[PDB]
Structures are given as structure tokens and as C-alpha cells.
Amino acid sequence: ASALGKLQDVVNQNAQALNTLVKQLSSNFGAISSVLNDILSRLDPPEAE
């Protein structure tokens, strides 16, 4: 099953990039929370910006 090394490598690289992006959707980045809806619901626009 080791014949198709390059094709599997390419598939794995693309999947890794997509998974990294989706996981990056969930880092605080310094804000109060990593979810936008709670930020909008808890704070007024001047303090939520």
C-alpha cells in the first residue's frame, strides 16, 4: 500500500491546512471570548469594537 506515496502526501497536506484553518477559528486572539455572538450580546458597540 506504499506505492501512492505522493498522492497521499498531497491529500494529507491539503487536509492539514484546512484543519489548521478551522481550528484557528477558535483562539481568543486576546479578546474576551473566541465566539463573536457572545461578544455582541454581552457588550455595547463602543466596548465591543
Binding site: 474576551i32 450580546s41 454581552r42 457588550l43 455595547d44 466596548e47
Partner: protein, 49 residues
């Protein structure tokens, strides 16, 4: 209580109305950090001290 040995009361399992406190005229200061005083009747918390 004194400044030291300050009281600590736990509040849970209730319907909390925060418009009664904000509408109070006596309160000279009502600073809110991390939350909007107007957007307090729309939230839900686990424990209030």
C-alpha cells in the same frame, strides 16, 4: 462589614432582575466591566457573588 473581612454571599437558582438596581437613584456609582448594564436581563450566569 469592614473593608477587610468583606462579606461574600452566593446567589444561584433564581430569576434575577437587574433593572431594579440600575433604576435605583441612590446608587452614585454603577460601573460595569466586561458587560453592558442595559444588556444584563438577556444573559444567563452559573453563579453570582
Amino acid at each position: 462589614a469592614s473593608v477587610y473581612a468583606w462579606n461574600r454571599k452566593r446567589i444561584s437558582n433564581c430569576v434575577a432582575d437587574y433593572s431594579v438596581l440600575y433604576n435605583s437613584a441612590s446608587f452614585s456609582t454603577f460601573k460595569c466591566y466586561g458587560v453592558s448594564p442595559t444588556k444584563l436581563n438577556d444573559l444567563c450566569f452559573t453563579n453570582v457573588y
